[PDB]
From Swiss-Prot, chain B:
Component of the ribosome, a large ribonucleoprotein complex responsible for the synthesis of proteins in the cell. The small ribosomal subunit (SSU) binds messenger RNAs (mRNAs) and translates the encoded message by selecting cognate aminoacyl-transfer RNA (tRNA) molecules. The large subunit (LSU) contains the ribosomal catalytic site termed the peptidyl transferase center (PTC), which catalyzes the formation of peptide bonds, thereby polymerizing the amino acids delivered by tRNAs into a polypeptide chain. This is Small ribosomal subunit protein uS12A. The modification 3,4-dihydroxyproline is found at residue 63. The gene is RPS23A. One of its GO terms (molecular function) is structural constituent of ribosome. It is found in: Cytoplasm. It comes from Saccharomyces cerevisiae (strain ATCC 204508 / S288c) (Baker's yeast).
UniProtKB/Swiss-Prot annotation, chain C:
GO terms for cellular component: cytoplasmic stress granule; cytosol; cytosolic small ribosomal subunit. The modification Phosphothreonine is found at residue 47. The gene is RPS30A. This is Small ribosomal subunit protein eS30A. Its main location: cytoplasm. One of its GO terms (molecular function) is structural constituent of ribosome. Present with 37600 molecules/cell in log phase SD medium. GO terms for biological process: cytoplasmic translation. Pfam families: Ribosomal_S30. Keywords: Cytoplasm, Phosphoprotein, Ribonucleoprotein, Ribosomal protein. Component of the ribosome, a large ribonucleoprotein complex responsible for the synthesis of proteins in the cell. The small ribosomal subunit (SSU) binds messenger RNAs (mRNAs) and translates the encoded message by selecting cognate aminoacyl-transfer RNA (tRNA) molecules. The large subunit (LSU) contains the ribosomal catalytic site termed the peptidyl transferase center (PTC), which catalyzes the formation of peptide bonds, thereby polymerizing the amino acids delivered by tRNAs into a polypeptide chain.
UniProtKB/Swiss-Prot annotation, chain D:
Component of the small ribosomal subunit (SSU). Mature yeast ribosomes consist of a small (40S) and a large (60S) subunit. The 40S small subunit contains 1 molecule of ribosomal RNA (18S rRNA) and 33 different proteins (encoded by 57 genes). The large 60S subunit contains 3 rRNA molecules (25S, 5.8S and 5S rRNA) and 46 different proteins (encoded by 81 genes). It is found in: Cytoplasm. Gene3D superfamilies: 3.30.70.3370. GO terms for molecular function: structural constituent of ribosome. This is Small ribosomal subunit protein eS24A. Residues 101-134 are annotated as: Disordered. Residues 104-114, 123-134 have a biased composition (Basic residues). One of its GO terms (biological process) is maturation of SSU-rRNA from tricistronic rRNA transcript (SSU-rRNA, 5.8S rRNA, LSU-rRNA). Belongs to the eukaryotic ribosomal protein eS24 family. It comes from the Eukaryota.
UniProtKB/Swiss-Prot annotation, chain E:
It is found in: Cytoplasm; Nucleus, Nucleolus. Present with 1390 molecules/cell in log phase SD medium. Residues 21-182 form the Bms1-type G domain. It comes from the Eukaryota. This is Ribosome biogenesis protein TSR1. It comes from Saccharomyces cerevisiae (strain ATCC 204508 / S288c). The chain holds residues 62 to 243 of 788 of the full protein. Required for 40S ribosomal subunit synthesis. Required for normal export of the pre-40S particles from the nucleus to the cytoplasm. Its subcellular location and association with pre-40S subunitshifts from mixed cytoplasm/nucleus to all nuclear in RPS19 disruptions, suggesting it acts after the ribosomal protein. Belongs to the TRAFAC class translation factor GTPase superfamily. Bms1-like GTPase family. TSR1 subfamily. Interacts with RIO2.
Length: 185, 144, 60, 134, 182, 260
RNA sequence: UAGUGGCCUACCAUGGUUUCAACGGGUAACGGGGAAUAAGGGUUCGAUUCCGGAGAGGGAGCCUGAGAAACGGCUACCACAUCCAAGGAAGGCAGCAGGCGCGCAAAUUACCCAAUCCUAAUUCAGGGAGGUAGUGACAAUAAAUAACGAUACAGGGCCCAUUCGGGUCUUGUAAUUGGAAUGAGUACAAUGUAAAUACCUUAACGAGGAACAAUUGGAGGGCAAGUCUGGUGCCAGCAGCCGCGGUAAUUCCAGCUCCAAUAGCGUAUAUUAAAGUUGUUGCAGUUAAAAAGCUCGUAGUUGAACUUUGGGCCCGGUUGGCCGGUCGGA
């Protein structure tokens, strides 16, 4: 047998499912962000688990410990690189105050919306998966792509599959070869 | 002194002390004597299938007020006779005796949902076919 | 039912009878649009009965 | 393979097998795959050698279209290929003639079917072939 | 467990041998086609013993061909499709019952589905399904396996105790029949 | 378990081979010879996946059944041959030639060398003894049995052994100031002028050892390996010179120096 | 013996272990990293991809050999059990793929040495060790199941605040729309592969809501969500625990309709958590279960108080900044 592949389980089911105020305050962000499940929210709320646990574990050891000066100084330099934690507020203090909408916004789920070329968070949600969307070359086919702060500036169309130019598609040639041109065939 | 030794040589007492007080806990003595293996006709299982013996005679350990269409069953992994139960009750028409079930508890290892002695096991799947797609009027709901 | 007559397909006739059960509104718009309609249900205006209430929308 | 771009990157020039082995870029845009024995006659002549000193493996695409990353070999001679190329790829090229086997299970049956005779089996063609015919 | 050993001994008395041990297997398709003179023959072209030789226009129906690999004499009742008066009546000795499943004829709501309800609601002694379709392995070339899935599920819409229903194009599935008998 | 072992499972290799966790099931277990099993680094772990002159095993044996590669002046041709510590590897390729001495990570690397020091090799004299016909001899760390040595040479010193014929040319004593190199334990690939010895009758003999940046550490004495004086190595040591930078200052070298 | 040795053997000595728990008994006991945990400690499990041990159905025994008390080696016993021409004659799937039986409970009698390797006299041969394909809702990951306007208004604002001028903007009623637009699926094409599937690729073809339609459990409290309407009025029902129906049922059968999770939700047992109900941290004994009838006592567990302070000479690693001569730093 070969060497065992490892695999994690990234969502954290809640303590009380029938807690009505939570369910009301959890549906508030589904249709706001155009999501699919509470598992969508459980993704973020399981990231917050390990991040907010490592942050509280590192503070318990007093600095002049270079472990805190190494593993902390890259975590603090990683969430910045995504675009969720802000540069002015990085001492791993504000990271415990950071919340779900912050991570859930730094996503091309959203960021097709709030830097132009949007027309909905539904009109563009179908265009992540119809791939009328791009980065530098390679279409980021998943709305939870977590845009790493920089290719935001590099939002582009796909050169194939139009509305960025260069094609007609799979329904024009039943129709603009019968009606829009071939009224007289 | 709070009734206990404390001094830092007395652990000799303490892990022999709690050793004799775990037996006053209930599931400890239930567990470490194999009582689930010497008894409990599942034998530590989670399900069992067995033939239906017959229609069941109601002996009141309260309260569900009818002849509850229940089934005397005797298993085949062991052969130990247990009274059983069907939910979605009624429909006493659609299997003979000496016919198969699949048993599973009520939620406390049963012990009480109706006026029937020892009725603690819901039937899940008669003869391999289910009940939930058989109370769904695809197939039909058995007899004893 | 009729396997090779009606239901050997995964679905084209799930029941695609234009004879409708509910009067041309069977479209619960599934998944993301379903929770979108539920987000329109709960976040525009509405409140129904007096904070605490019985169990599925109706008159008091 | 419009905007052809056969960019010769990650080149290792092996003297020990007389090979020029390197990864290959190919930009497709708006047409399909760039076959075994389709690049193999196009990169050969402009990269220092002949068509029998060409070999190909790797080669799928990146997500979206255009760019495919292959891995090409081009040998410092021609009979280099007749001894250092693995034989499946010249079967994939016609530079080898595929000696057609039977099967795995059939050869493993036949191995076991002749291990039950000590020698060459010429006598049993004459030993029992005349006696039990009576 | 030795009693359980004793439980697995005395039941091996009446069914295992040749001297008064040959079983009725009655083949009635759900389809008017498929005509079980090829089910006796074209299926058993993988067995290749001489049940081929007595697969005869002189219809025997006592087929005591001792097949030389699992050591048993046999009996396959091959009835005509119309004689509906003993197919439901000879089924008290008849252990092994085999449906004939075809996607050529739709299994009829008065012939086929009601032979399902007739053979079924007398109590099917043993239902080991066999797809006996020789002329159905090329009705598609583009993931053609819907000719088999539509029948494997159709065995399971009422009488589901088989998982797969076997094609006539694999080798050991014809002496899996004699495994099913022995 | 009924005699020896012939297979080494993948994940049962030592970590300094740095095999990938996927892509296979086994490890290319080294044959017996001039080194330990646990710090061997055989021929195919050197060739196909640290130099990438071969792509897989049959192409490795295509080299090895062509008499190209050399390990210390001979024409070694076996795949699992344990060319271990200090062994010069010379190729009959485009003539680039290598040593086998670690990094600070306790792992081997590619180290191309000159021909002043390709000609010879070294060794910790693990034994000096008086064998047959009253002949003194020495046994170095790999396998060599050199006759007739200097009688003022004792155990734990080192030699300068040639590769053409096995002739000791000169040696190094054991005292302080000696530029040293560790073979085993934890501080593997270190360096730095022995402070002093500890005797410990019947036990381990440890040793206190500085470095370049004056950072003491205490190995055992069956891992100390004396090869010099105050800044006098007798080979051409690789880029970095063995001194342990911490992982805070390889996120200051690989990150703050080459990363602008 | 390869060798230490009560490992034996021949004479001697009378020892050795133990309430610091000997010895005996049970284990649903193969030992070490793992798991569920998650304030911490504690708890329970570990057959299982690695290491070590053991066995080839159970006990023996021996050969060859550097190496075996070897079983895809051998001899014998014991338990099985094949063909037979009635004369041995043959045999160990706790290897792979399959079968039977047992369960609740677990795959296809495929392809191939391309790879990781191993063996051989050996670049070449062999390898069910291994890899790839088939079954596969174990467990895990990312994501289908659909757009934005116009038009009839309701308003909240609000426009210029001469607001008292109509709708710039939306909440839905709108099934009236409006063309453009696409994938799951079929395909040349070649890559892909030892040979094929697929999967990034790719031209041709396939969408309008009847499309190509997401189910699963609930709907009295814990526990969101109606006291809506009919048949039902102890008749079944409903109930994990409580609680209703005797006719004004929020709790019955149904119709609606709604609530959750969502290709995923239930159920059964088992453990963990909350459980200071195992308590060393960290319980409780006047009456709620629990202080004994009162002394003496050994092992154990603890055991009174005392042993070189105050200050000088400087070194200044660090800080306060009036210094700011560097204009974040000594």
């Amino acid at each position: 047998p070969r060497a065992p592949r490892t695999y994690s389980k990234t969502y954290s089911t809640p303590k009380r499912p029938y807690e009505s105020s939570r369910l009301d305050a959890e549906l508030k962000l589904a249709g706001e962000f155009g999501l699919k499940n509470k598992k969508e929210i459980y993704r973020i709320s399981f990231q917050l688990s390990k991040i907010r646990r490592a942050a509280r574990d590192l503070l318990t050891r007093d600095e002049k410990d270079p472990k805190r000066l190494f593993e902390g100084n890259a975590l603090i330099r990683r969430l910045v690189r995504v675009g969720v934690l802000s540069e002015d507020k990085k001492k791993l203090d504000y990271v415990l105050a950071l919340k779900v909408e912050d991570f859930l916004e730094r996503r091309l789920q959203t960021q097709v919306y709030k830097l132009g070329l949007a027309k909905s968070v539904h009109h563009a949600r179908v265009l992540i998966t119809q791939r009328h969307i791009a980065v530098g070359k390679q279409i980021v086919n998943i709305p939870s792509f977590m845009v790493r702060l920089d290719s935001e500036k590099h939002i582009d169309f796909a050169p194939t599959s139009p509305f960025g130019g260069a094609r007609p598609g799979r329904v024009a040639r039943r129709n603009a070869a019968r009606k829009a041109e071939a009224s007289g065939e | 002194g709070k009734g206990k030794p404390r001094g830092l040589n007395s652990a000799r007492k303490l892990r022999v002390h709690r050793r004799n007080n775990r037996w006053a806990e209930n599931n400890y003595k239930k567990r470490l004597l194999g009582t689930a293996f010497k008894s409990s006709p599942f034998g530590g299982s989670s399900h069992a299938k067995g033939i239906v013996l017959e229609k069941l005679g109601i002996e009141s350990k309260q309260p569900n007020s009818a002849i509850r269409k229940c089934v005397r069953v005797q298993l085949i992994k062991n052969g130990k006779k247990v009274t059983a139960f069907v939910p979605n009750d009624g429909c006493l028409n659609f299997v003979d005796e000496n016919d198969e079930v699949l048993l599973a508890g009520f939620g406390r290892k049963g012990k009480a949902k109706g006026d029937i002695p020892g009725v603690r096991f819901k039937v899940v799947k008669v003869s391999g076919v289910s009940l939930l797609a058989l109370w769904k009027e695809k197939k039909e709901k058995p007899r004893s | 039912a009729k396997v090779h007559g009606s239901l050997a397909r995964a679905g084209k006739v799930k029941s695609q009878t234009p004879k409708v059960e509910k009067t041309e509104k069977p479209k619960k718009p599934k998944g993301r649009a379903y929770k979108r309609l539920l987000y329109t249900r709960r976040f525009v205006n509405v409140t129904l009965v007096n904070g605490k209430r019985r169990m599925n929308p109706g008159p008091s | 393979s419009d905007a052809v771009t056969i960019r010769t990157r990650k080149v290792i020039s092996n003297p020990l097998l007389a090979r020029k082995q390197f990864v290959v870029d190919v930009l497709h845009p708006n047409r399909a795959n760039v076959s075994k024995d389709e690049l193999r006659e196009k990169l050969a002549e402009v990269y220092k050698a002949e068509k029998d000193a060409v070999s190909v493996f790797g080669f799928r695409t990146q997500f979206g279209g255009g760019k495919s990353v292959g891995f090409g070999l081009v040998y410092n001679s021609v009979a280099e290929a007749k001894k250092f190329e693995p034989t499946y790829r010249l079967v994939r090229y016609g530079l080898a003639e595929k000696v057609e086997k039977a099967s795995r299970q059939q050869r493993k049956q036949k191995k076991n079917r002749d291990k039950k005779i000590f020698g060459t089996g010429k006598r049993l063609a004459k030993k029992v072939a005349r006696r039990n015919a009576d | 467990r030795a009693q359980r050993i004793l439980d697995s001994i005395e039941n091996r008395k009446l069914f295992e041998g040749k001297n008064g041990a040959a079983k009725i297997i009655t083949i009635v398709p759900l389809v008017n086609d498929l005509d079980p003179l090829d089910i006796l023959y074209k299926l058993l072209k993988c067995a290749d013993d001489e049940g081929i030789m007595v697969q005869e226009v002189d219809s025997k129906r006592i087929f005591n061909v001792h097949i030389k690999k699992f050591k048993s004499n046999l009996k396959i009742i091959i009835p005509d499709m119309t004689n509906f008066l003993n197919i439901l009546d000879c089924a008290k000795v008849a252990d092994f019952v085999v449906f004939g499943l075809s996607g050529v004829q739709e299994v009829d709501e008065e012939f086929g589905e009601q032979i399902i309800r007739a053979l079924e609601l007398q109590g099917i002694a043993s239902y080991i399904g066999v797809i006996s379709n020789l002329s159905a392995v090329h009705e598609k070339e583009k993931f053609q396996l819907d000719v088999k899935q539509s029948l494997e599920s159709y065995f399971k819409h009422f009488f589901p105790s088989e998982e797969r229903v076997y094609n006539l194009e694999k080798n050991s599935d014809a002496l899996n029949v004699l495994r099913t008998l022995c | 378990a009924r005699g020896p072992k012939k297979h080494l499972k993948r994940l049962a290799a030592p970590h300094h081979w740095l095999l990938d966790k996927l892509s296979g099931c086994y490890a290319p277990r080294p044959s017996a010879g001039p080194h330990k099993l646990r710090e061997s680094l055989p021929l195919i772990v050197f060739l196909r996946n640290r130099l990438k002159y071969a792509l897989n095993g049959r192409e490795v044996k295509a080299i090895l059944m062509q008499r190209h590669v050399k390990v210390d002046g001979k024409v070694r041709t076996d795949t699992t041959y344990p060319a271990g510590f200090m062994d010069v590897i010379t190729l009959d390729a485009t003539n680039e030639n290598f040593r086998l001495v670690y990094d600070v990570k306790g792992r081997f690397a590619v180290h191309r060398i000159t021909d002043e020091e390709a000609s010879y090799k070294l060794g910790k004299v693990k034994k000096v003894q008086l064998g047959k016909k009253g002949v003194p001899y020495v046994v170095t760390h790999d396998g060599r049995t050199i006759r007739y040595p200097d009688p003022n040479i004792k155990v734990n010193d080192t030699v300068k052994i040639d590769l053409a014929s096995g002739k000791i040319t000169d040696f190094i004593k054991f005292d302080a100031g000696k530029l040293v190199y560790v073979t085993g334990g934890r501080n593997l690939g270190r360096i730095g002028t022995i402070v002093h010895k500890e005797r410990h009758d019947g036990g381990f003999d440890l040793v206190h050892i500085k470095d370049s940046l004056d950072n003491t550490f205490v190995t055992r004495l069956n891992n100390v390996f004396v090869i010099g004086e105050q800044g006098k190595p007798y080979i051409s040591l690789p880029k970095g010179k063995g001194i342990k930078l911490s992982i805070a200052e390889e996120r200051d070298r690989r990150r703050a120096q080459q990363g602008l």
